[PDB]
């Protein structure tokens, strides 16, 4: 297969989109979605019609903090790839259990990965791949950035070891936000990837989502 094809598997604005579109292959818009708690179904599908119809491929991302809503939303079968936003930890694991398609950032606003030899296992067997975003590095100080880069590397370590699928995303909710494949290959590195994983991580892993 192609050497060098790439996906962006999460952008949240119309620029960043547009903008992201030259430098990847495929570009996935997300809708973020906050619920406190259920939709809304009627509006939601009439919302994502609209999407698929102006993006192509489009997916949702729930944040919340009621395990429930993941189930919920997950038995519907919507024509969305399901991502849950990380951070809390009953979050991290229902994402997981529900056979969620991504769980992005389970270290989002933590101290700690978000993520363990359990929960690593379950996403390998549940087939639920892991988001590696970079926008909060982007929006932190020195100290910051170093905290997050200990968690990416703490979270990429189980990931390798039980097989999890994964990707590196920008999650940019700008156009400023959006970096190019071999940026987004460069936070592999950093993190502790090998060339070849960084590159599967915007190529191979993707594609096993996207087909829809």
Not at 55 to 67: D, N, Q, S
Not at 85 to 95: H, P, T, V
Request: glycine letters at 8%; aromatic letters at 10%.
């Amino acid at each position: 297969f192609s050497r060098d094809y790439f996906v962006e598997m999460d952008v949240r604005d119309e620029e960043a989109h547009e903008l992201a579109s030259d430098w990847f292959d495929e570009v996935v818009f997300t809708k973020k979605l906050v619920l406190e708690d259920p939709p809304d179904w009627g509006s939601l599908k009439e919302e994502l019609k609209e999407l698929r119809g102006k993006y192509g491929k489009v997916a949702l991302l729930l944040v919340t903090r009621k395990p429930s809503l993941i189930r919920e939303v997950k038995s519907r079968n919507l024509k969305a790839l399901l991502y849950v936003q990380g951070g809390d930890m009953r979050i991290n694991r229902m994402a997981i259990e529900s056979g969620v398609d991504a769980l992005i950032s389970p270290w989002f606003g933590r101290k700690d990965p978000g993520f363990d030899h359990t929960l690593a296992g379950m996403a390998a067997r549940r087939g639920v791949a892991i988001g590696f975003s970079l926008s909060p590095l982007l929006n932190a100080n020195p100290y910051g950035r170093a905290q997050i880069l200990r968690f990416m590397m703490k979270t990429w370590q189980l990931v390798k070891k039980y097989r999890v699928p994964r990707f590196i995303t920008s999650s940019a909710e700008s156009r400023w936000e959006v970096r190019g494949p071999r940026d987004l290959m460069s936070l592999g590195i950093n993190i502790g990837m090998e060339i070849p994983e960084a590159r599967a991580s915007l190529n191979f892993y993707p594609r096993t989502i996207v087909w829809k």
